[PDB]
Every structure is written in C-alpha cells, then in structure tokens.
Structure 1
Amino acid sequence: DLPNNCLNASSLKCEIKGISTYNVYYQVENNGVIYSCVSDSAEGLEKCDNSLNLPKRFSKVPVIPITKLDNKRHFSVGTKFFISESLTQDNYPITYNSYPTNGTVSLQTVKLSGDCKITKSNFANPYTVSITSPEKIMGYLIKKPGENVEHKVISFSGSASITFTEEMLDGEHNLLCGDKSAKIPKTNKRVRDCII
C-alpha cells in the first residue's frame, strides 16, 4: 500500500478529471494501472492533460459540506471534492490527501467551519469588527444570500480585524466565520460620511 505514484505526476501521464474550489481530482498512470487521487496543493500537475484550468494554490480553509438544503443560499462557499462510498459496491481505491482508501469521488458544496470567536461587541470603532480563532488557520467571508459568490475566502490566523465597505452595509449582507454566522444591519446614510 504505497500510493506514492500520485506523488510523481511531474513525469507520469496524468489526466485532470475535475477541479473544485478547494481541491483537485485527477488520475495518474505508471505501469498501465490508473490511480485516481485528490490533492490540496497541485504541485506536479503542470504536465498533466487538461492541466489547463487549475490554480497555483488552494487556500486550505477548513470547510465541511452542506446538510441544510435551505441553508445553501446562506452558506454557499464553493465546491470541494469528498470521498463517498460508490453507489455500486465498487471499492475503487482513491487516495484523498495522503490517506488511501476506497470509495468514489463526489463533488459537494461546502460551508465554513471551526471556532470563529465572532466578536459582536467591540469597544472602539463600531464599524470595525474583530474576529479571533484558536485554530491554526481559519477562513471567513462576507456575501449576500446567494450571488454565486465563490472564492472571497480569506486565510486568517488568530487576530483579524474587519472593516465594512460603503455598499457592504446593505442589510442583506451576511458575515460567515466558522460555523458561526451573523447578519449586518443597514446603517443610516447620514450617519455615514459623518466620520470626517
């Protein structure tokens, strides 16, 4: 059990099958046997086939999929591949990340996740909100309901300060950090520009 053949994609013939917003699904081939694999950094895919639409770096923000269909529009954070069990008994061995196992690859929408200490109350600068997380890395995002807004994920760690843009304070906008979620109310237009 050494799926390191997926580590060598620089020189082995590989085809790009699918591309998500947070991982990549491909399959290499060494001695006449295909090896489906999923990676989170895409280091040796430059010479693969369909090595066309892939990015420099997946931002590595912890994300878990959606169970709440109703919460889709409220928690769309993009697409990420996950190891599912095949619909047939098919036990096809895929090596998600560095861990090998069987199952089938399946693309699912995901949500943000973790322990974002969303600091509602902030002493000074009420228009500036702070956000902390004990996790090593953590991701947040500000978006309206839906909008098909992908990316806009920020790799933050520990201390993080957030200010709102002029349009952003439209009440329908929502701040997503970790599991937690809040809604920003529309501030008065004349209270704005009074900052001067």
Structure 2
Amino acid sequence: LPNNCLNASSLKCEIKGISTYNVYYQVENNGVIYSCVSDSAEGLEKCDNSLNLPKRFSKVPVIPITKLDNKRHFSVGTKFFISESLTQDNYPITYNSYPTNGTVSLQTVKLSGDCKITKSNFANPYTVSITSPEKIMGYLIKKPGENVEHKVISFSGSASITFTEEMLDGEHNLLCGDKSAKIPKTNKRVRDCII
C-alpha cells in the first residue's frame, strides 16, 4: 500500500531529485523511508530541498534515448525511470502511483508518440499542420545542441506552427514525437520579404 507517498504534505520528505518531467522524493513514516517518483509536484511543496520544484510537470509522452548519437539531435530533457540494481539490493518504489521494486535512474529523453508532420502545407508554406491521435502529444523546434529543456509544447488533437524568423536557418528541426523533419534555410532577403 504505497498510500504514504501520495499524501506527502502530512509527513517528512526529502526531494531526492528533480528531472524535467517528474520528481524523485522519499517520505519518512512509521520509521520506514518510502521511495517514490511522481509527475504531480503537489503536496511536495513543503518537503526538504523542494525549492526549485516547478509548478507543473509537462506530462507529454517521452522515452529514454538509447542511441548516444541521437542525444544532440533529439534530446528534449531528462526524466526518472525505474531500473534494476546491480547489487541485489532492490528496494520497493512507487512510480506515478504504481508499486514496484527497483532502483531509480535519471535518463536523457527523446520525444515519443505518434504524430504527423505534414510536409505539404500549400495554403501558406510557412504555416504547417501537426496532427496526432494521442490524448496528449508534444512538439519542439530544436537546432541540434540547443538546451531546450522546458521549451516543449503539448498539442492534444491537432495544431499548427508558424516558424519564427529566428528558426528558419537550415539547421533547425521540427521534432514531434517519433517523427523529425529538417527545416530548410530561407534566404536572408526572402525572410524579410514575407514579413
């Protein structure tokens, strides 16, 4: 019964770690430290070392990056996941209110889900549509290397994106989940022209 973790305001707790999309905390109760990870940020506002805890965690679908090449081009932050311990000392954790045993590890993250970057946008070639079936789905335009941790945008059923004059250089990328599409370099003149 991991109910100790969902009511952390009542008890003593330590924020053991804050990622981009979730938080690692342990609460102390009955003399028994209970370790936990959640997406909420709610009722942990009083915990030790909670100061930087954001108001809200994004809650878009994301998975860990497995190919190290891809970090630069696809990284969209960090998040905690339940791994298993190298020593046989696995201790029980609660992940988003699911009970398990394991060890917590932080891991750099790429966007996941099913999204549709529609390359043909004829009505205005600089207003592009994005459509996904998922309840919630996330996009982000990212030159490879830029720190864009909290710059992700969540769009639910469908969306439409107009590129800023800044982003139009050849090296930016429209990441929307498992999909990824290179943004072409618009000439110095033409860019000023359109606006």
Indicate whether the TM-score tops 0.5.
Answer: yes
* DSSP-derived class of the 1:135 partner: coil
TM-score, normalising length from structure 1? 0.97
Structure 2 CA distance for aligned equivalents of residues 169 and 192 of structure 1: 8
1:168-183 pair list within 5 angstroms: 168-183=167-182
- 1:116-158 alpha-carbon deviations (Å, 9 max, x no partner): 1111111210011110000010001011101222111111111
The 8 Å contact of residues 6 and 97 in structure 2, kept in 1 or not, is answered as: no
In structure 1, the gaps of 5 or more residues are none
Structure 1 CA distance for aligned equivalents of residues 44 and 26 of structure 2: 10
In structure 2, the gaps of 5 or more residues are none
Structure 2 partner of 1:132: 131
Aligned-pair RMSD on alpha carbons? 1.0
Offset of residue 193 of structure 1: 3.1
Structure 1 CA distance for aligned equivalents of residues 40 and 91 of structure 2: 23
Structure 1 CA distance for aligned equivalents of residues 54 and 71 of structure 2: 25
Structure 1 CA distance for aligned equivalents of residues 185 and 50 of structure 2: 44
Which stretch of the first structure deviates more once superposed, 183-192 or 33-42? 183-192
Structure 1 CA distance for aligned equivalents of residues 75 and 188 of structure 2: 29
Structure 2 CA distance for aligned equivalents of residues 49 and 137 of structure 1: 32
Structure 2 partner of 1:185: 184
* DSSP-derived class of the 1:103 partner: strand
Which stretch of the first structure deviates more once superposed, 107-116 or 183-192? 183-192
* DSSP-derived class of the 2:166 partner: coil
Matched residue pairs, number?
195
- 1:63-97 alpha-carbon deviations (Å, 9 max, x no partner): 00001101110011111000000111112000011
Structure 1 CA distance for aligned equivalents of residues 99 and 21 of structure 2: 19
Structure 1 partner of 2:79: 80
Structure 2 CA distance for aligned equivalents of residues 10 and 3 of structure 1: 15
Offset of residue 189 of structure 1: 2.2
Higher strand share: 2
Offset of residue 3 of structure 1: 0.3
- 1:27-47 alpha-carbon deviations (Å, 9 max, x no partner): 001110000000101111011
Structure 1 CA distance for aligned equivalents of residues 41 and 148 of structure 2: 23
Structure 1 CA distance for aligned equivalents of residues 4 and 57 of structure 2: 21
TM-score, normalising length from structure 2? 0.97
Structure 2 CA distance for aligned equivalents of residues 42 and 157 of structure 1: 22
